[PDB]
Design a protein around this ligand. Structure first.
Ligand SMILES: *[C@@H]1O[C@H](CO)[C@@H](O[C@@H]2O[C@H](CO)[C@@H](O[C@@H]3O[C@H](CO)[C@@H](O)[C@H](O)[C@@H]3O)[C@H](O)[C@H]2NC(C)=O)[C@H](O)[C@H]1NC(C)=O
Lengths: 248, 114, 200
C-alpha cells in the first residue's frame, strides 16, 4: 500500500512469529519501543492492527515517539510513549524498476500537522496563497502528489526502507495475534515441576485411568486439589500425585 | 526561512555544455542531502543527480550516468550542477530539492537542448 | 404468554472435572420454577443474562443481535447453511427484519437450548442438543449446559433482538446452587438453595 492508502488491516486470530524475522539477514534500523525486541514472541498484547509502506529512507530517524520533521508531519506520526515496533529494512532489488519506480507518489503538502495514526487520503491541492486555483495549475497551486525517485543507482539513504507498523494499542479488545510459545517434551513418573498450557505447579505426574468429556482441560477432586490435567499436543489425559514427604 | 534559487541557465545545441547552481540560505548543505529534479515537456518530474549529506558518495540515475557531475561548495553554501554531452532528451526545467524540516522548492532554471 | 421452567438453566461454571462430589457455588443462575416469556412465532431487554430455549424443526431462526442501540452507532451472531458468522459490527435492519430464504469462526424433534452470561467483559457460549419430542412446552427433563467459546468485547449490552417455531426467554440473577456431579463428570441434578426451605 501507498502513503495515501495504507490500510488499517485487521488480521486477527492467527499467529505472526517474529523469531524468523530476526534471522532474515535483512533488518537494518529496527527499534521496538516500550518493550524489548527480544521478548516480542512470548508475551503479547491486544490491538494487533497492522500497516505497511515503503518510506523514502532519508529521514527514518524522524520517526520516533515525540520527534517531528517531514515524514512525521506529512506521512505518518508516532505519539509519545509508543508501544509497538516499526521495522525499517531496504527493498533495493524489487521496489526499483528501470527509469524510476513512480508507482508510489506521495503527499508533499498538508494544511495542518498530521494526527498520530491517521491514514490520510485526499485529492485537493495545497492552499498557500489567498487566490484559489481555477483547476489549471499555476504559481500558487502547489500540486502535492510529488514523485519519489526510486532508481537502482540510488544510495542506501536514497533507496526506500520498507516499514511495517505493528501498532499496539490498549483497549477493551481481544488479544488476537501473538507470537509462538515453545514447548519442551513430557516427563513422567518423577517428582517434578511442570509448566503446562496455562497452569504450573509441582508433583508426581503419572498415566491416567479415567476419561474426560472433550471440553475439560484439567480436573480437581473433593476440597479442590488439582489431581488431573490434559496435555495439548498428545491428546492424552495425565494425573497428578503429590511428592514424597513425611516426618522422620 | 530556507530560500532556494537557481541560476546558470541557457540554450545549448547538441554537443554543448552548461553549468547550473543552487544558492541556499538558512541551512548547511554538509548536514543535509541535496537533490536535483528536472521537468521535460510532455513528461513528469524525475531525479537527475544528488550528493549525500556526508559529501562522500554522489549518485546519478540510469539515463544520466557517466556524463553528468554534481559538486558542492560548503563555504558559499551553493551546489554546482555540470552539464556535459547533452542530448535533446535533456530539454527540461531543473529544480533543486532539500528536506530541512519541510520541503522547499525554488523558482527553477530553464535548460533547452536542441 | 408465560410458562413454568421446571428444572432448566444449569451450567458448568468452569472447566473443572469433579467426580461424585456435591459441589455448592453461587453464580448467575436461572431460578428453578420461574416463568419465562414464551413467544409463538420482538425486542426483549437484557438485564444480566438470558436463557434461550427455542425449538424448531429446521431452525429458521438463525440470528440474534446484541448491542446498546442495535444500529450503526454490537454483535451479529448469525448462522448460515454451512457456517456461522459472528462479528462485532455496527449494522442495520429494516422495518421488517427477516432472513431471506471483529472475529470469524467456522462451525419437536430438536430442542436447542442455550444460555448466555455477562461478567468481566466476557461472553460465553453454552448449549445442549435434547433429542426428545414434545410440541407443547419445554419438557420435564434435566440437562446441564457445557461451554463452547469465550471472547471479550467490553461492551455494556442493554437489550437484544432475535431474527428468523417458537422461542423461550428467561433471565439470570445471582443465587446459590448445589451441583450433583457423577462418576463420569457431568451434572446430574441441581438444587437452587433459595427456592424452598427443603432445598435450603
Ligand atoms: C499437536 O502437535 C503434535 C505434533 O505436531 C501432534 O501429534 C501428532 O499426532 C499424529 C496423530 O496422532 C501422529 O501421527 C501418527 O504417528 C504415528 C507414530 O508417530 C504413526 O504410527 C501414524 O501412522 C500417524 O502418522 C504424529 O506422529 C504426532 N506427531 C508428533 C511429533 O508426535 C498432535 O496431534 C497435535 N494436536 C492437535 C490437536 O492437532
Amino acid at each position: 500500500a501507498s502513503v495515501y492508502a495504507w490500510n488499517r488491516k485487521r488480521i486477527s486470530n492467527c499467529v505472526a512469529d517474529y523469531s524468523v524475522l530476526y534471522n532474515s539477514a535483512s533488518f537494518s534500523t529496527f527499534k521496538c519501543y516500550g518493550v524489548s525486541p527480544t521478548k516480542l514472541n512470548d508475551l503479547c498484547f491486544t490491538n494487533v492492527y497492522a500497516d505497511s509502506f515503503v518510506i523514502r529512507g532519508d529521514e527514518v530517524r524522524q520517526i520516533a515517539p515525540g520527534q517531528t520533521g517531514k515524514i512525521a508531519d506529512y506521512n505518518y506520526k508516532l505519539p509519545d510513549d509508543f508501544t509497538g515496533c516499526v521495522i525499517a529494512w531496504n527493498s533495493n532489488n524489487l521496489d526499483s524498476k528501470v527509469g524510476g519506480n513512480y508507482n508510489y507518489l506521495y503527499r508533499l503538502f498538508r494544511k495542518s500537522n498530521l494526527k498520530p495514526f491517521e491514514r490520510d487520503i485526499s485529492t485537493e491541492i495545497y492552499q498557500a496563497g489567498s487566490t484559489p486555483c481555477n483547476g489549471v495549475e499555476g504559481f500558487n497551486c502547489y500540486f502535492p502528489l510529488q514523485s519519489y525517485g526510486f532508481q537502482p543507482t540510488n544510495g542506501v539513504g536514497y533507496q526506500p526502507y520498507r516499514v511495517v507498523v505493528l501498532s499496539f494499542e490498549l483497549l477493551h479488545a481481544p488479544a488476537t495475534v501473538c507470537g509462538p510459545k515453545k514447548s519442551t517434551n513430557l516427563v513422567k513418573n518423577k517428582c517434578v515441576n511442570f509448566n503446562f498450557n496455562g497452569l504450573t505447579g509441582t508433583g508426581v505426574l503419572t498415566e491416567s485411568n479415567k476419561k474426560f468429556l472433550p471440553f475439560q482441560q484439567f480436573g480437581r477432586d473433593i476440597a479442590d486439589t488439582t489431581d488431573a490435567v490434559r496435555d495439548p499436543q498428545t491428546l492424552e489425559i495425565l494425573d497428578i500425585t503429590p511428592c514424597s514427604f513425611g516426618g522422620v | 526561512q530556507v530560500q532556494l534559487v537557481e541560476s546558470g541557465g541557457g540554450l545549448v545545441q547538441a554537443g554543448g555544455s552548461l553549468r547550473l547552481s543552487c544558492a541556499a540560505s538558512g541551512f548547511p548543505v554538509k548536514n543535509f542531502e541535496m537533490e536535483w529534479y528536472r521537468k521535460a515537456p510532455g513528461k513528469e518530474r524525475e531525479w537527475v543527480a544528488a550528493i549525500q549529506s556526508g559529501g562522500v558518495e554522489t549518485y546519478y540515475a540510469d539515463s544520466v550516468k557517466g556524463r553528468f557531475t554534481i559538486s558542492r561548495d560548503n563555504a558559499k553554501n551553493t551546489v554546482y550542477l555540470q552539464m556535459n554531452s547533452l542530448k535533446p532528451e535533456d530539454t527540461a526545467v531543473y529544480y533543486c530539492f532539500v528536506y530541512v524540516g519541510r520541503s522547499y522548492i525554488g523558482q527553477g532554471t530553464q535548460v533547452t537542448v536542441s | 404468554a408465560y410458562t413454568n421452567s421446571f428444572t432448566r438453566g444449569v451450567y458448568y461454571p468452569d472447566k473443572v472435572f469433579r467426580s461424585s462430589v456435591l459441589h455448592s457455588t453461587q453464580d448467575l443462575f436461572l431460578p428453578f420454577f420461574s416463568n419465562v416469556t414464551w413467544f409463538h412465532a420482538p425486542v426483549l431487554p437484557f438485564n444480566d443474562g438470558v436463557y434461550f430455549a427455542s425449538t424448531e424443526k429446521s431452525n429458521i431462526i438463525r440470528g440474534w443481535i446484541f448491542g446498546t442501540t442495535l444500529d450503526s452507532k454490537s454483535l451479529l451472531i448469525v448462522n448460515n447453511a454451512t457456517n456461522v458468522v459472528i462479528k462485532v459490527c455496527e449494522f442495520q435492519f429494516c422495518n421488517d427484519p427477516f432472513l431471506g430464504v471483529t472475529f470469524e469462526y467456522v462451525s419437536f424433534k430438536n430442542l436447542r437450548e442455550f444460555v448466555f452470561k455477562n461478567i468481566d467483559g466476557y461472553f460465553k457460549i453454552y448449549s445442549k442438543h435434547t433429542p426428545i419430542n414434545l410440541v407443547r412446552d419445554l419438557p420435564q427433563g434435566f440437562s446441564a449446559l457445557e461451554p463452547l467459546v469465550d471472547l471479550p468485547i467490553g461492551i455494556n449490552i442493554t437489550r437484544f433482538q432475535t431474527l428468523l417455531a417458537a422461542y423461550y426467554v428467561g433471565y439470570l440473577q445471582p443465587r446459590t446452587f448445589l451441583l450433583k456431579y457423577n462418576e463420569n463428570g457431568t451434572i446430574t441434578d441441581a438444587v437452587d438453595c433459595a427456592l424452598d426451605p427443603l432445598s435450603e
